Design a binder for this molecule. Structure first.
Ligand SMILES: [Cu+2]
Ligand SMILES: [Cu+2]
Ligand SMILES: [Cu+2]
Ligand SMILES: [Cu+]
Ligand SMILES: [Cu+]
Ligand SMILES: [Cu+]
Ligand SMILES: [Cu+]
Ligand SMILES: [Cu+]
Lengths: 337, 336, 336
């Protein structure tokens, strides 16, 4: 398309919502290609990542870890206004794995505190894709400080299974998984720092061990539990988009399955089916589609069970509906031999 | 199926066999859906896992690490009686990744020492699937103490390739891979404990490093080597089911291939072909089909070679038959 | 084929070149099956792997880490002359994941210093495949000393997508990724040694932590940058072959994609498409095909970003051509 043709396209402003929720969108595209406009302000901010009160100096797109999910359709243009407020201390940028050229956009979006930039790219490939900050010389430090999220580029005709049958979800959640590398003192207790920069050298040491201290969903141990548990009902079709910008994960819905899993995150690659545990390599997003069949509590985890239950990578679903004794029944409840 | 229809299905008891062997079964289903009955007794016992006398307080379905492979067909029911003897000291349960609801069954099967339970579930999805104990709040500890196995839910019409041609194995083995996290004293010597709970805090510290001290098949270094090597013959078709309930692995048949590999373990997902090394994520089972073409010794390993040859994740096959010089020949033997 | 039939086939001698370049070859086979002849000399040599002058006692096929890429077509025979000079100190051999029997060839190729051997195998399965040394009892040590490479067995009709459409590359590069485990002294400084055997015990201790000190392409931090950046132009189709003989990796072309990726490395397994980051398990090779659409610098990384940017797993592409503002444009450049 020419500059004139792109200028002629309709514009649509989108208001982002915080993960694990996803902004309003249509599964099947409404009309022809559009220029879809998003705005995010970067916030360097202290966050608490566990019940003990462990602090991280987060670097957060739109003030959240992960950054919010942006949704467009194939061959739309994504136009992001990215703002680095003067209250921040570092240069930041953005790299979309969905985009083509200039390192995913990082080469065109280097902004110092007090600067903004507007990047437009054509969403040429359908799938879920990571985005993250990547300042030359400081790449993993920004990413593992939480400066990452994902986008979804839906096919214009919505999702289909590997054989061309439509797959329409009732609801969608975005689970961003974060590996954190928090320095410890000689007592083995987590350290706190005055400024983000004070934590650099100690943190790099931990990063080099390749062993995170915390592996969390939505920025903290237990963030998607209790009154923040995800919800569904028997019969409800749910898409769960999962990203990890730096490190492998292996998602598993305990008590359920991934009926269709785009494990590579890319919708022109046919989905795997009937999955127990799927695998998403660091630097990627994946998506699983499931129809709930049983009520009750589910745990959605990274199925390295140490990572899930010792390091924090566990979320819950609360599911309403009627129990199905055909699928599963307690023939004899625990009782004396 | 209606209530009377489910109640009318035949019930069949099956006797289990210790890994890597697999109980008798048919690849193509015999007759209509059945309720297939298994029984397992949980054993808490000390096992020795290496050549240095290193001990683990194992938590073992049916007394083995891994637990035995249960085989059913799609839309059968699996009905397990699980028994926790009063001589044990921990609560246990069971979670089948093949099952739907109640965390895979764990929510319905929490049994204290001196209790039993019976769980039934419908095997709605074909594939190999992990099962493991998962007491809330102590999940990874039970699993990395060896309390895991797998099941196979065969399609009612047996296995097929991506093009619908039947794939019929002559034999099947089940390799369960176990990551252990054994505490060491400040001299680097592995520690021993009186009771399983005594090791809990020290073990969790090791677990949190995400670095196993041992990675083994069938519960110990060299368990499937030497006089306990698996066997085959040239021309024989072998299915190798492999599971890892907690941690990634990358199986490789040294000297062979995975001709067809269901790397995700699910038979409705077409198999990869001609594989050198396949990948099974922690919390899953996979299966590889191979027709042996050369005799001699093979090594079957996790192809992180440090995990295989320093930490224990290496098995052998001994294969009989005639050497094929077309496939491979020594044109000039090692010489000065 | 019979011995007589094989003896009658045409022979072609190949001259190998240093990675990341690949020796002259045709994508579509030229004529019927041939016996393709290669020669490699093993060199035990010091390599410097970072800008701090850190040394590895490399065990290098053809003097490079990785060893060179060998290219044949399906149902050709690969005939390798392998030489272990008298100047070396250790026994070596070679195991081809592409081959069938004798552990991939290792059982037939054990050569002491001053010996040579010739191995022939039939390349029956199309794909990219790891090769590596594997002396019984010292397997991972040789591998993580850089003694590994890959081969490509092209289909006789060249590459195709999952729907039978031809995929023809303009350029091919081979990136061998290496995990190193370098001992450190009490002050955290990397140790140096004056013979390969002197490093053994210290190196095994680091290996057992499963935590590499360095993760590098082409044997060194920054190797495939600057004078060794890979090159292309807008419109050019490039195949990137990537191997890792011991440890998982997750390749990613920063600023681009893998348009078609044989993540398992096997050409009869249809490629994944539109990939952001693909996954290659330790013990395997994979290949990605991409058509460049933008000029500029690209980084090609293992997308564990600590591995890429702290431990060394980062390469560059320098791409010439016209910028495409439809694909991407700066609507407002960084400004107050
Ligand atoms: Cu990236
Ligand atoms: Cu599980
Ligand atoms: Cu190998
Ligand atoms: Cu940054
Ligand atoms: Cu940043
Ligand atoms: Cu248990
Ligand atoms: Cu060697
Ligand atoms: Cu060797």
């Amino acid at each position: 398309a020419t500059a004139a043709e792109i200028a002629a396209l309709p514009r649509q402003k989108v208001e982002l919502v915080d993960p694990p929720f996803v902004h309003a969108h249509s599964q099947v595209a409404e009309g022809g290609p559009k220029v879809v406009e998003f705005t995010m302000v970067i916030e360097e901010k202290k966050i608490v990542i566990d019940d003990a009160g462990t602090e991280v100096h987060a670097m957060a797109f739109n003030g959240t870890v992960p950054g919010p999910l942006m949704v467009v359709h194939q061959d739309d243009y994504l136009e992001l206004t990215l703002i680095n407020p003067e209250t921040n201390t570092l240069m930041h940028n953005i790299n979309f794995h969905a985009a083509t050229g200039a390192l995913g956009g990082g080469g065109l979006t280097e902004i110092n505190p007090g600067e903004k930039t507007i990047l437009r790219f054509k969403a040429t490939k359908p799938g879920v894709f990571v985005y993250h900050c990547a300042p030359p010389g400081m790449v993993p430090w920004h990413v593992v400080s939480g400066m990452n999220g994902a986008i979804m580029v839906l096919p214009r005709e919505g999702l289909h299974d590997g054989k061309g049958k439509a797959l329409t979800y009732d609801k969608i959640y975005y689970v961003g998984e974060q590996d954190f590398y928090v320095p410890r003192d000689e007592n083995g207790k987590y350290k706190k720092y005055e400024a983000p920069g004070d934590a650099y050298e100690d943190t790099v040491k931990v990063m080099r061990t390749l062993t995170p201290t915390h592996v969390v969903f939505n920025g903290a141990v237990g963030a998607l539990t209790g009154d923040k548990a995800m919800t569904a009902a028997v019969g409800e079709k749910v898409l769960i988009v999962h990203s990890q910008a730096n490190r492998d994960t292996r998602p598993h819905l305990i008590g359920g399955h991934g009926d269709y899993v785009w494990a590579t995150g890319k919708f022109n690659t046919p989905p795997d089916v009937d999955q127990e545990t799927w695998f998403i390599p660091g630097g990627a997003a994946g998506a699983a589609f499931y129809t709930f069949q049983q009520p009750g509590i589910y745990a959605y985890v990274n199925h390295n069970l140490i990572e899930a239950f010792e390091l924090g990578a566990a979320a819950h679903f609360k599911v309403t509906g009627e129990w199905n004794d055909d699928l599963m029944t307690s023939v004899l409840a625990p009782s004396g031999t």
